[PDB]
Amino acid sequence: AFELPDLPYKLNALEPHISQETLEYHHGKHHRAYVNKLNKLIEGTPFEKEPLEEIIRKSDGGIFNNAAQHWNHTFYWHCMSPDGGGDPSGELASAIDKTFGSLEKFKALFTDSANNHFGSGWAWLVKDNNGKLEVLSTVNARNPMTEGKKPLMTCDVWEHAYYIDTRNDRPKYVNNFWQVVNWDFVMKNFKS
Amino acid sequence: AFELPDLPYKLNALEPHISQETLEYHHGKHHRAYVNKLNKLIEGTPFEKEPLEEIIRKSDGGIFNNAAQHWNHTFYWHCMSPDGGGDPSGELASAIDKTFGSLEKFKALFTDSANNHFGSGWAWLVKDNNGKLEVLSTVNARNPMTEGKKPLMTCDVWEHAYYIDTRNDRPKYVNNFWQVVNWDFVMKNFKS
Ligand SMILES: [Fe+2]
Ligand SMILES: [Fe+2]
């Protein structure tokens, strides 16, 4: 029932910050696999016709892992852009200043979250039910929406996300992520 | 006070099954970093002068993660050899046949454990202190000795173990592992 979404940009659009080869493997093999495995697992189960978000909220095991990874990568592609980088603007910028003190403090907090996460996972900027901004990392496929928190931005820190381009140097990859970060998408997410 | 152990063979000794480049990054950077971070964390703490096994059994958080990974990687290098591959012999072979039915069923079981483990981790052949052989995988840095089980063989399934050589294709890497598996080490562990 689920499909691999097209990338929001060309395979070479994030160069030289994220390579074409990485996008070929990361989207064309890793994400594609999650979609295919998800579809097979949920066939003939209560999750067969459920929305993706509802599968994530109610499932466990392989169904959860593939469903959550599918959502997580779909979200991740929109968090980057050839037009990305620079600073946020408007109320997102204002809210970041209020919550974290400044943009550089927030960036440092997200960078540390991403760099210090042990093993596979995701670094997140989220909004809680009270509208308060928060930085946190999750293990493997886990997604903050299972704790009632809305994702605004994510950075994949599974080793496949960067090993082709930076090998073991995850911090260099996170710096590369900042050069392509799509603030327009983050702000769109912030404003609902 | 811990030290990066020397690799038991030359950097090209596992070619073409595991590349020189992989061993340069995996041992020379990944393993080296675990040893260094371990030493910094344990200094000034009750774990400073403890044996590595005791640090693993009594610590948590970053100390555990770095202590366990240091142990795991050291163990992992001896589980491979340029003279490796082929079949086990003697008591080990007999014990494998008794417990799992045959060598190929054991290989299938270990292969599936290694291939199916979601995220970063380790596939293991262990012996419980009843003496029974068991195949299982652990998440991230976790080591079966905390459950009183003695490791006999391990295969690192963190993406850095193979991404340079097989990219997303972990199954191909596990086949490459079987060509260099060091049964002499596994049997030594089995018998002691
Ligand atoms: Fe990913
Ligand atoms: Fe490793």
UniProtKB/Swiss-Prot annotation, chains A, B:
Coiled coil: none annotated. It holds the Pfam family Sod_Fe_N. Its cofactor is Fe cation. Binds 1 Fe cation per subunit. Destroys superoxide anion radicals which are normally produced within the cells and which are toxic to biological systems. InterPro entries: Mn/Fe_SOD (IPR001189), Mn/Fe_SOD_BS (IPR019833), Mn/Fe_SOD_C (IPR019832), Mn/Fe_SOD_N (IPR019831), Mn/Fe_SOD_N_sf (IPR036324), SOD_C_sf (IPR036314). This is Superoxide dismutase [Fe]. Homodimer. Belongs to the iron/manganese superoxide dismutase family. It catalyses: 2 superoxide + 2 H(+) = H2O2 + O2. One of its GO terms (molecular function) is metal ion binding. Keywords: Iron, Metal-binding, Oxidoreductase. It comes from Coxiella burnetii (strain RSA 493 / Nine Mile phase I). The keyword Metal-binding applies. Its EC number is 1.15.1.1. Fe cation binds at residues 26, 73, 156, 160.
